[model samples]
Target: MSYARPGGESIKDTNLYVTNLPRTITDDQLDTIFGKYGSIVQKNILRDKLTGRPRGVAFVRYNKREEAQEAISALNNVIPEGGSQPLSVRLAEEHGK
Candidate 1:
């Protein structure tokens, strides 16, 4: 299932959702990995607010939409080095209008 904003608009091109990450992974690692595919605007690894540990999920925003798509096509389902699980990459959803 998917979600959208109240007006039924699609997600923006620059944003991406990534999951299946290792909790030990760092923000710099995420940047390095995704940077190979594009110029990143931002990379955020979700963490527990209290513990400050990774939540095994992240969001990446690229400078260009094509680069985002390329990353999605090429890196999706591919495991990062030293990672135990494959990645799940897709366009990010927009919430709360």
Candidate 2:
């Protein structure tokens, strides 16, 4: 979920940015954790472009915008299994659209 800007325009998006992930977290783990919220269109863990190692960050996209917002409300600041810190969950900024 995103708030309106000073211009009173809210951005509606389905992508969620998730951080504070454990380096050991896997794609399947991400699926299991986020799947409960909604139908996931795509999910990915950021990796080093060259080394191919997990970067403790990821993105999850839900088919429905409401589901993404629900995920943020429920999972934000909650520590996942194998993680030592609470997660930072929020709407992802518009990218190369």
Candidate 3:
């Protein structure tokens, strides 16, 4: 996956993407849970601006590509938080070339 840095600096040695989270989930929640696995470079909750509603999705940037891959393997369909809905974790789709 291609990594994008908002500023000029690049996010080195990072990979993995998480999605399909509850709209109400926050960055702290994500960090608290995913933090146990590995380093988190960035966390983002995508939302709809007009309604101010969560898109029921998120993005997690892992410090290492392997950690991202490992999270996907271990966490998919596991529902770590004990919620009824199974968390959907996958590599984020590339938006642009």
Among the numbered candidates, top lDDT falls to 2
Report, for every candidate in turn, its global Cα lDDT versus the true structure.
Answer: 0.56, 0.58, 0.54
Per residue, candidate 2 scores C-alpha lDDT tens digits across 1-97 of 8482112113334566677665565566666766576656676766455775645677766445566666676656444454455566766665311
- By lDDT, rank the candidates, best first: 2, 1, 3
Compute each candidate's TM-score over C-alphas: 0.59, 0.61, 0.57
The TM-score of candidate 2 is 0.61
Candidate 1, 1-97: lDDT as tens digits: 7442112123434566667765565656666656576556666666455775645576655435566565576556445455556556766654210
Query: What C-alpha lDDT, on a 0 to 100 scale, does residue 40 get in candidate 1?
Result: 65
Off by over 4 Å in 3: 1-15, 49-55, 74-81, 95-97
What is the lDDT, from 0 to 100, of the residue 36 in candidate 2? 73
Among residues 3 or more apart in sequence or in different chains, the pairs in candidate 1 whose N, CA or C atoms overlap within 3 Å are none
Residue 46 lDDT in candidate 2: 67
Off by over 4 Å in 2: 1-13, 48-56, 77-83, 95-97
**Which 10-residue span in candidate 2 carries the lowest summed lDDT?**
4-13
Off by over 4 Å in 1: 1-13, 48-56, 77-83, 95-97
